[PDB]
Design a protein around this ligand. Structure first.
Ligand SMILES: Nc1ncnc2c1ncn2[C@@H]1O[C@H](COP(=O)(O)OP(=O)(O)NP(=O)(O)O)[C@@H](O)[C@H]1O
Ligand SMILES: Nc1ncnc2c1ncn2[C@@H]1O[C@H](COP(=O)(O)OP(=O)(O)NP(=O)(O)O)[C@@H](O)[C@H]1O
Ligand SMILES: N[C@H](Cc1csc2ccccc12)C(=O)O
Ligand SMILES: N[C@H](Cc1csc2ccccc12)C(=O)O
Ligand SMILES: [Mg+2]
Ligand SMILES: [Mg+2]
Ligand SMILES: [Mg+2]
Ligand SMILES: [Mg+2]
Lengths: 260, 260
């Protein structure tokens, strides 16, 4: 009989592709030594042969996809004015107001990319030809209850197109090409809203404008856009049972435990 | 006579390669219209032809340099335990303690990469062959007085090697190959410390261990490493007069004003 604590320890060391039954007769000590050897070899193979981090590599692959498709790569501030949250319509009744990491008196860690993308669309509308296509990838922050699908520090991809061609059909085509390119199974389920699901897991929320909120941001053109969590994409792709395996972490490297 | 406010406005629109004398007889209104046209064309050319952000592209170029050189790419948390700052020896007498962005009661936005790199070196020492070579690129945060060389939100490259080959000569060779690869002029000036200078601007501080601090982090092997600011590298490379031109920003895109 393995104790529940010895099983938690072995499950840290287990990778989805492992073919080992934790319930078989071998003693903890031996099963731990086997898995430690495997995970050490896994890290050695990464270090010898490719050396790229899953989250960095995914960001670079997504970047090439969107640049190639005519979207401008944005890198905007992560620490943003608290006033942006209110101007997004996030009042006390909405659940997100309680999820904000505040910094100082007038700043917060951004929980979303939409504010900065709105500001860029408005400013670039002055210099760039129709349609304006932009995207950003980077850290976002939300206070969350413990969950196998939520991190407090995560990474989001946001893209938005404004002007002509901003139809639901074009939006679904971008999403569909994107996820088939990455090899991620999905279903699209549906101010017009749209969620991109993998089973019960939300990969993305997507939107079609105009919506009344646009006016506060100086936007008055149709638009389409979506936001995706990179760690959720990694979790699906690598079949991780807990999203912590995909996070920025000192505890996991490319889903391999670092506590060996 | 241009007013000092009209000159500030024109200097936002001026790019280093511009050949225009702000002091010549043409009226503000005309000089503004010329520069607006130029900056709009500049943005249009980026959008038509490459579409990559300076900071993202630099991060990807640095990543390839270090991966190719045998360094493992790390992506570790940006929001870190406040206890890491104290354990770095950052007490009240040191100036950095006053520079920390605190979050909640027990967390902060990291002002440096050294804590997470120490933790990774210690853990990986258990699985990887000697020498252990790692690097990370990502956001760091410090409270700063207004300066043409300091941002409160910046991006740092940190690399560290532990075990054999950890000589000052090897460290200077990495730095030298790196900056000659990027095309950035520098001088190295020098527990052994080393600063990499561009004129009066510090591009990097570098170090050779062991040092007594290592013991608190579970490290007991020689090491070499360095930290570089990406926005400072961009500032030098593109001859920006103020580092805000290179930052994560809503006010500049690849050093071009977005307020057109
Ligand atoms: N805490 C989180 N951890 C990881 N990914 C997240 C988190 N919050 C949001 N995301 C991702 O970001 C995308 C866009 O954000 P958003 O639509 O606001 O999320 P959401 O509606 O709060 N999803 P959920 O909390 O799972 O019901 C989501 O579809 C996820 O893929
Ligand atoms: N506020 C900042 N804005 C931009 N880059 C920075 C900032 N602080 C540090 N860096 C960069 O990060 C590198 C390593 O950090 P560190 O050696 O701690 O900086 P530092 O000693 O405080 N430099 P300085 O404040 O200019 O005297 C520096 O050499 C810079 O290239
Ligand atoms: N639910 C949204 C996801 C998103 C990011 S950019 C963007 C542009 C259009 C639609 C959605 C988004 C959010 O919370 O940001
Ligand atoms: N002054 C240092 C720069 C740095 C980052 S990683 C690293 C590893 C070795 C030496 C320096 C560094 C700091 O403040 O972090
Ligand atoms: Mg949520
Ligand atoms: Mg949603
Ligand atoms: Mg300083
Ligand atoms: Mg220094």
């Amino acid at each position: 009989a393995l104790t529940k604590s010895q099983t938690d320890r072995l499950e840290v060391l287990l990778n989805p592709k492992d073919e080992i039954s934790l319930n078989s007769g071998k003693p903890f000590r031996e099963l731990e030594s086997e898995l430690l050897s495997r995970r050490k070899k896994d890290l050695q193979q990464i270090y010898a042969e490719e050396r790229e981090n899953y989250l960095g590599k995914l960001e670079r692959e997504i970047t090439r996809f969107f640049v190639d498709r005519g979207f401008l790569e944005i890198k905007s501030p992560i620490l943003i004015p608290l006033e942006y949250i209110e101007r997004m319509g996030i009042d006390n009744d909405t659940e997100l107001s309680k999820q904000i990491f505040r910094v100082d008196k007038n700043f917060c860690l951004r929980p979303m990319l939409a504010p900065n993308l709105y500001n860029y669309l408005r400013k670039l509308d002055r210099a760039l030809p129709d349609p304006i296509k932009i995207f950003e990838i980077g850290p976002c922050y939300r206070k969350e209850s413990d969950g196998k699908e939520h991190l407090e520090e995560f990474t989001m991809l946001g893209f938005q197109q404004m002007g002509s061609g901003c139809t639901r059909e074009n939006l679904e085509s971008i999403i569909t090409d994107f996820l088939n390119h990455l090899g991620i199974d999905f279903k699209i389920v549906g101010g017009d809203t749209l969620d991109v699901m993998h089973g019960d897991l939300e990969l993305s929320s997507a939107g079609v404008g105009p919506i009344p909120l646009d006016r506060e941001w100086g936007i008055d053109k149709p638009w389409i856009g979506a936001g995706f969590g990179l760690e959720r994409l990694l979790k699906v792709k690598h079949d991780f049972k807990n999203i912590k395996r995909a996070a920025r972490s000192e505890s996991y490297y490319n889903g391999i435990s670092t506590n060996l």
